Design a protein around this nucleic acid. Sequence first.
RNA 1: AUCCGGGAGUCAGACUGCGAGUGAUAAGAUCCGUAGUCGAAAGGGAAACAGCCCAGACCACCAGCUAAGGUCCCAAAAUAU
RNA 2: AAUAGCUCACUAGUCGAGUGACCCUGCGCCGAAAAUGUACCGGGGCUAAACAUAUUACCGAAGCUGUGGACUACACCAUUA
RNA 3: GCGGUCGCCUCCUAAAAGGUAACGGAGGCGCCCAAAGGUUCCCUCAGAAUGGUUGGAAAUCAUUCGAAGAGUGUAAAGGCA
RNA 4: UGUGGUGGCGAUAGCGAGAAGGAUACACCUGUUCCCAUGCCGAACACAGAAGUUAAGCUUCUUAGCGCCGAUUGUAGUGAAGGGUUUCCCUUUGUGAGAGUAGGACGUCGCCACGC
Lengths: 58, 141, 76, 94
Amino acid sequence: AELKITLKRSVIGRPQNQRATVKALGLGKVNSTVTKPANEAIKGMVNTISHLVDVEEV
Amino acid sequence: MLVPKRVKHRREFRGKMRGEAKGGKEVAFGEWGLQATESHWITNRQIEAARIAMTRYMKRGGKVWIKIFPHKSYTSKAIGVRMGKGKGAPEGWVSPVKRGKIMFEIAGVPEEVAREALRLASHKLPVKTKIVKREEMGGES
Amino acid sequence: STSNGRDSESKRLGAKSADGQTVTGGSILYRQRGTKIYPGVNVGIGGDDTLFAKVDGVVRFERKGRDKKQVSVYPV
Amino acid sequence: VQLEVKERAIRPRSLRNQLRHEGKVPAIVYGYQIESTPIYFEEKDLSKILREHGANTVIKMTVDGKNINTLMSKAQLDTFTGQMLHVEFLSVNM
RNA sequence: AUCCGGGAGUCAGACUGCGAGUGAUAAGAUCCGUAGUCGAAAGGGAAACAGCCCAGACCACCAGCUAAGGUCCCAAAAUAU
RNA sequence: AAUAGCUCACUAGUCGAGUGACCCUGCGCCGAAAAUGUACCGGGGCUAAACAUAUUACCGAAGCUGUGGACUACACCAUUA
RNA sequence: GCGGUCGCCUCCUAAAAGGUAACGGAGGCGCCCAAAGGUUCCCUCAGAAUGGUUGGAAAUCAUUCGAAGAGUGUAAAGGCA
RNA sequence: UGUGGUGGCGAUAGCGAGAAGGAUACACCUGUUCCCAUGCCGAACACAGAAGUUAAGCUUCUUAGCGCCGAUUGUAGUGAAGGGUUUCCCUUUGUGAGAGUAGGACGUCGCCACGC
């Protein structure tokens, strides 16, 4: 499948796992969209950045 | 300054502990018992006072069960001594009690004198108590 | 008035390579004091109970039934 | 004779803390014919069997069908509460 | 990310959430692990407030949407169902 | 100083609906006394403008978007750059 | 300041890789052995029970039970039947 | 196919208890002259033999008393999010033990030889 991914919260004040997992995806500014497939690596990304990211499907 | 019960040493100074929670540890000897339902240290002398407040309503019969024993030891410095040097000389023998555990047990006496003696006990311990039977067993006998 | 405050240095024991590596000749695997893990194929014991790899290959760990474990190197 | 047999799932994770504040019984059974399922109970059905018969009773569990006689191992309490938790069943035949 | 060179600063740190020690399981105490902010961070909230919750200013505009927190009056928004 | 004590037991001696005893739980009360002046709601004040469960609206920042200017870096496209 | 301490080795504190401080909690070291080293053969301990002169709770014996409850030059861990 | 030798596989292979056997083989037993030996002792160790016995060892079969291996399920504990007192507790989301059990289980596989 495909997953749309956006920041809807800041990165500030949250540890060095979550900053780096965000930077791995391509989420630079707030409210910036990234469309990526549904592997089980990207689901593993989302299951640790659930509290920062809203995810839809395509 | 009355200590009833002590240990034999094997180590003088012990680390000040860290108690969180317990469970189970029910009546087995019994017919009437307390339950300390908070968590505190309980020293020597409180168990003396609890003994005597038990036994002065236990006239000619009825067993007393003491299920908690002071193993550990506190230490304390003087007054006028700064912070600094090693741990002060141990003075006291105190054991922790968490929730759930049972302070004392009674059997051989009907219910009214039992609840009398147990409320005479629980005004000498710093923990909120209850009163529980040996309620149900597979065989009560 | 204290008679304490004495230690030794830390001497840094423990396994120094995992499984599945490619391991050259004569390199240390699991430094011990006292035999905790016995050697198997191509692994010898030095003076202070350490564990080599004699031949180049891949470290894999095993176990001798119930009690104690093994290290052995298989080329490939 | 006919208690409450309502089935469960494999790992209902920490929703079970809410099962403490609603009056529910997370209960075990493992026995003779059918191996193992977790089953709901509610606490106002044992007390007829408890205060009618005792502690060596015969609970006739259902699969919504013919009965299964059990030989109860533990129906225990929790501290400070007096309610049903860790209720290990056990069932051997007649 | 590694390697080869040119040039420095730093060796007094704090508090907050979480594990421990000494202390009286006292301190804005002291001494260590671990994460954040301050130091080197302006803007909103907690009346005022370096360290707490939200969020990182290239610059202009008398445009728009939300976070934390709020909506009788100082004081902007329900005298909401 | 014994000793009267609705005859501290009963007579439905009268009238004619409920009356005791335990637990578990939600919210309160007492316990609660210091030094210039009310004096921990920010003030006014409030019987909800308090709390508890649910539901939509809206306010709220130099955060995000809208129009425009500048600079740097990588690019595209065609000389020029 | 008066006291105590200054190099090395073990255990705990040490948050189950490694590392980690305090005038935190516990102990040793500044050697020894020409065999207590090398190899080749052979071997299995501490106890208890029951009898037996001196002979005694506790010497030398005898049978049986006995995975370790023993020993390892020296402190402590990790090992070793 | 029986027996002996000989190997791996976590004692599910074991320990206790009971029964049966000598075609071959194994074992006990006879003895010490010889290679050899006892800190004393042919017990062992070593070498000669073959009167007998299955009593023991060994092999086969029965047995869930001790030991071993045990699923599922419930709970403590806890990563990541949160909320109150802040000593401590509670709620969503991921992972789950230790005990206590139903149960499995009185072995399995490989090679050579002899006798039949």
